[PDB]
Design a binder for this molecule. Structure first.
Ligand SMILES: CCCCCCCC/C=C\CCCCCCCC(=O)O
Length: 155
């Protein structure tokens, strides 16, 4: 995705309120397989799978328009994307604990993408997808064909 040349139409898209608010993880599916595919061993899988997750999306207190804040509170981790826009690429610390290049993008009007690109190894990327389904935020994570769907409800 790259539309730098003439981005007046895609200047800044404002997050649909469907993705906004605080969501607590209800359940997930095929998460272990995703972890294996992602290259996480048993130890990591013992962490990652047992990590409860709370999503927080809000208008960015940065004081600007269109921007949004998003943090990923878990049991063992914690990440806080201060002031980001969809289609925007910024540096920050992801769940993987490093401070690397990250990009968000509204790919469809019901699915946002979170892509983590490590400064050290940009090939060991990782992508989450924020889909809406019903009154739940449904995350889709796919690696090596392995899709895992994490079902988040509001708080
Ligand atoms: C599943 C990818 C985990 C990447 C970081 C692994 C090291 C830290 C341990 C556990 C991570 C907890 C978060 C798991 C992914 C949450 C995805 C999400 O819903 O945003």
């Amino acid at each position: 995705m790259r539309g730098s040349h003439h981005h007046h139409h895609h200047g800044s898209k404002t997050l649909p309120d469907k993705f906004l608010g605080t969501f607590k993880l209800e359940r997930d599916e095929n998460f272990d397989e995703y972890l294996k595919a992602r290259g996480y061993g048993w130890i990591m899988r013992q962490v990652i799978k047992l990590a409860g997750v709370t999503k927080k999306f809000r208008n960015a207190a940065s004081g600007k328009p269109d921007r949004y804040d998003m943090e990923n509170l878990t049991t063992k981790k914690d990440t806080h994307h201060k002031d980001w826009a969809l289609g925007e690429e910024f540096q920050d610390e992801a769940l993987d604990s490093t401070q690397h290049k990250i990009t968000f993008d509204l790919k469809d009007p019901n699915t946002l993408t979170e892509t983590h690109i490590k400064v050290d190894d940009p090939t060991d990327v990782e992508t989450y997808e924020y889909r809406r389904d019903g009154d739940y935020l449904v995350m889709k994570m796919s690696w090596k064909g392995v899709s895992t769907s994490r079902y988040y409800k509001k708080q």
